[PDB]
Design a protein that fits this description.
The complex is a heterodimer of chains A (435) and B (351). Chain A is built from 13 helices and 17 strands. With 435 residues, chain A is α/β, with parallel strands linked by helices. In chain A, a hairpin with a 4-residue loop joins strand 15 and strand 16. In chain B, helix 2 links the parallel strand 6 and strand 7. The radius of gyration of chain B is 21 Å and the shape is globular. Classes of the chains: A alpha/beta (435), B alpha/beta (351). Chains A and B meet through helix 2 and strand 6 of A and helix 3, helix 10 and helix 11 of B. The complex binds adenosine-5'-diphosphate and calcium ion (5 copies). It is classed as structural protein.
Chain lengths: 435, 351
């Protein structure tokens, strides 16, 4: 009957990105200018400094981008930052300095490369020594994905079948030949850059469609295994509900859920809890360093999401919980490229199932009181302080005891124990080792 | 040999000296910044008459500091200061003459080839991989909030608080004596720091976390002294770090590390504040308490607009972020332009 005015009360690419770019890469504690030939190619283990000079309306101003790879050591990140200052000071302070991290590039940055960026997995040595995987190889796999236009990226993935996703296309470079896998929801712009990338092969490409995968294919990917084959990902977002991710945290002092749009793996913080909506499933990502206050409230607030769904509830929608490092290939598909070297020690989900026992990796699904409503655990369980069965009110551990065994330990019923004074309740509990 | 000239970096720390060779993941030698008399230097010290040269992050016993630098160069690092250039750190607001006597001391009693002086907090932003941000360097004896924009500090907002690690350890000794223990054997001060550094943590809501301490034993942990005795620390775990947010605990009247950061950010330009709000880098050993990042997001979110994204940055290796910064800076092959040569000293004085 009234419109709360707070409903209403609740950035641009300064140029076309067509100016000149001078890409310098952090090598050996110094800046090495990249050859123009390798423009559009960044290594996720090395940091880069990009110098964009542009004149808009006859006004020459300067922007310095320092792109920090996800696996670039602290030494390269500092050298990237330290030299962006020096190229700024050389321009006298006329430069605006912008920090770019892998998988979260701004719109202007991707425009400088016409939206075609190739991020190999590798890099030069860090802290001045050892392995330098500066070669993609004779055999590698690439992942072409576009959240919106102007961001069509190709990133090197582990040459395994699990890495395959349905919303995207892939390019396999082998000694035998180059093949281009096509997914059910492969947008044209993604499919195009794959062919443009695959066309570099003097041998050519052989496009493959999902389902029509010949056997010579998997013998190069090592063999078949379940990849990101979800209903939502196979379709195109024109018809399936847009995959959404929310961040739940008490860090602001109040438990809140905030939407993360264009979500990727880096957006996940191991200190807070996240919820992913996929229509068919709703996942609860539990940070390893997350708070038990956050975890529970996220598990519950997820249920309030199914109920207040402004559409068909489908009340048996699986609200499943996942743990950092034990992510299934269907949870990762709504994100872009998933790196296992971060939290899963570089092991695929299948390799994790073998070592961790499959059962231990099983995703659990979400499903003041009287004495009856309290789960009764034995006295030996509640008397300890060391990893006791969870779900116990550690403040009032006396309730998790039975009415019978209560009278043997305390000498009275819980009905009389609560009518005793509070200083007595805290005293008798500590005596019986149940504080 | 060292025709590349192996460089060196020293963080002149209020309570701990962090020094090593440039181009390494971390410093090789970390020893306490103490000089003792009945010479006696380092952890070898603990009847004595101890003194702190850099008690408040600035050097006062100027020539006395030479002995500490000597201990670093000759005994801890096992190096010859004549053959290796040096990178020295300075406080956020060092006296203009503080640097000059450092310049002279290096070039004279040690005959260093070259030297450079860098702000401790500007080094910390380099390890973080950023040029813009406000740093909190909570050390042993002093804490500083230093806004940094595009590589250089903003001195109109550099702020300082003298509440830091050593004060917290003493407050733990008090509340632990209040708990019914008694360790003041001067050597036993380190046992308390081991308790602090391993069993303490910061609470998001001090009042709520204090209430659970009297209605339960959940937060209670146990510590084995070297005498084999197992003592139990309870509400003290979060009380010791809470002094940083409520300086009244030890008696000071200053504001806490949450308010000082707000004041410092607000003394800056409105447009640079968002990046300063989204790049709140943390440095120092006293920023290594569990949960300090969460509360600092909480407290700052309150005193700040409802539409400001607050991001507290906590590099895993922040106890040595200053050293890691200099090792990066010194190892720059473009740092010879900023080195000060011995000839330039003889010609221009320390200047
Ligand atoms: N894990 C930890 N938890 C809490 N405090 C710590 C931890 N590690 C070190 N400290 C404290 O940090 C202080 C040292 O910090 P540091 O950065 O060396 O100071 P400065 O650089 O001013 O010398 C010590 O007083 C120590 O008590
Ligand atoms: Ca590298
Ligand atoms: Ca500038
Ligand atoms: Ca896609
Ligand atoms: Ca949190
Ligand atoms: Ca310091």
């Amino acid at each position: 009957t009234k419109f709360d005015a707070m409903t209403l009360h609740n950035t641009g690419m300064v140029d076309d990105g067509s100016g000149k770019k001078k890409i310098y890469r952090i090598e050996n504690m110094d800046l090495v200018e990249l050859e123009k030939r390798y423009y559009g190619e960044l290594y996720g283990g090395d940091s880069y400094v990009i110098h964009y000079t542009y004149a808009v309306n006859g006004k020459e101003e300067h922007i310095i981008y320092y792109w920090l790879g996800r696996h670039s050591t602290s030494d390269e990140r500092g050298v990237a930052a330290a030299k962006t200052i020096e190229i700024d000071d050389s321009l006298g302070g006329t430069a605006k300095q912008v920090r770019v991290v892998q998988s979260k590039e701004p719109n202007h940055f991707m425009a400088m490369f016409d939206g075609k960026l190739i991020i190999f997995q590798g890099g030069k040595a860090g802290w001045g020594g050892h392995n330098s995987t500066d070669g993609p190889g004779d055999t590698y796999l690439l992942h072409v994905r576009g959240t919106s236009q102007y961001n069509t990226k190709a990133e090197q993935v582990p040459c395994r079948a699990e890495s395959l996703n349905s919303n995207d296309v892939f390019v396999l470079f082998s000694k035998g030949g180059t093949y281009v896998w096509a997914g059910k929801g492969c947008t044209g712009d993604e499919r195009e850059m794959a062919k443009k990338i695959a066309s570099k092969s003097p041998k050519g490409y052989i496009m493959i469609v999902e389902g029509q995968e010949k056997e010579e294919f998997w013998d190069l990917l090592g063999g078949k295994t379940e990849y990101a084959s979800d209903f939502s990902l196979k379709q195109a977002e024109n018809e399936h509900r847009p995959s959404r991710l929310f961040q739940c945290s008490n860090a602001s002092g109040v438990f809140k859920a905030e939407e993360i749009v264009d979500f990727v793996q880096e957006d996940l913080v191991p200190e807070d809890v996240f919820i992913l909506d996929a229509d068919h499933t709703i996942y609860v990502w539990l940070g390893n360093e997350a708070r038990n206050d956050e975890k529970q409230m996220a598990m519950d607030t997820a249920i309030e999401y199914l109920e207040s769904d402004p559409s068909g509830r489908d009340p048996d929608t699986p609200i499943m919980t996942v743990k950092q490092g034990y992510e299934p290939p269907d949870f990762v598909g709504h994100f872009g490229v998933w790196d296992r070297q971060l939290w899963s020690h570089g092991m695929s989900y299948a390799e994790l199932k073998k070592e961790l026992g499959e059962k231990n990796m099983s995703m659990e699904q979400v499903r003041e009181m009287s004495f009856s409503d309290v789960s009764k655990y034995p006295y030996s369980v509640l008397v300890q302080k060391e990893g006791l069965p969870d779900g116990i009110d550690l403040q009032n551990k006396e309730k998790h005891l039975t009415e019978e065994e209560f009278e043997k330990i305390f000498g009275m019923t819980y009905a009389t124990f609560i009518t005793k004074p509070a200083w007595k309740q805290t005293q008798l509990k500590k005596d019986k080792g149940l504080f | 040999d060292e025709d590349e000239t192996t460089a060196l970096v020293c963080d002149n720390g209020s309570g701990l000296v962090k020094a090593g060779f440039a181009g390494d993941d971390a410093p090789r030698a970390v020893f306490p910044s103490i000089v003792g008399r009945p010479s006696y230097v380092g952890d070898e010290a603990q009847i004595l008459t101890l003194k702190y040269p850099i008690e408040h992050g600035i050097i006062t016993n100027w020539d006395d500091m030479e002995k500490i630098w000597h201990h670093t160069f000759y005994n801890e690092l096992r190096v010859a200061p004549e053959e290796h250039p040096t990178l020295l750190t300075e406080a956020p607001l060092n006296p203009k003459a503080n640097r000059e006597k450092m310049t002279q001391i290096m070039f004279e009693t040690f005959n260093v080839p070259a030297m450079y002086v860098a702000i401790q907090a500007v080094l910390s932003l380099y390890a973080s991989g950023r040029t813009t941000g406000i740093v909190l360097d909570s050390g042993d004896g002093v804490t500083h909030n230093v806004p940094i924009y595009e590589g250089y500090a903003l001195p109109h907002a550099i702020m300082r608080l003298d509440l830091a690690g050593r004060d917290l350890t003493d407050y733990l000794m008090k509340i632990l004596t209040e708990r019914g223990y008694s360790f003041v054997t001067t050597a036993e001060r380190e046992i308390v720091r081991d308790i602090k550094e391993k069993l303490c943590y910061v609470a998001l809501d001090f009042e709520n976390e204090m209430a659970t301490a009297a209605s339960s034993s959940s937060l209670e942990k146990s510590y084995e002294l070297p005498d084999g005795q197992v003592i139990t620390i309870g509400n003290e775990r979060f009380r010791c770090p809470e002094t940083l947010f409520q300086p009244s605990f030890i008696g000071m009247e200053s504001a806490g590390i949450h308010e000082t950061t707000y004041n410092s950010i607000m003394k800056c330009d409105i447009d640079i504040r968002k990046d300063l709000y989204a790049n709140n880098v943390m440095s120092g050993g006293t920023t290594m308490y569990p949960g300090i990042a969460d509360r600092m997001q909480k407290e700052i979110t309150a005193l700040a607009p409802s539409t400001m994204k607050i991001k507290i940055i906590a590099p895993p290796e922040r106890k040595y972020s200053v050293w890691i910064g200099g090792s990066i800076l010194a190892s720059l092959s473009t740092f010879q332009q900023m080195w000060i040569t011995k000839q330039e000293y003889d010609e221009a004085g320390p200047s």
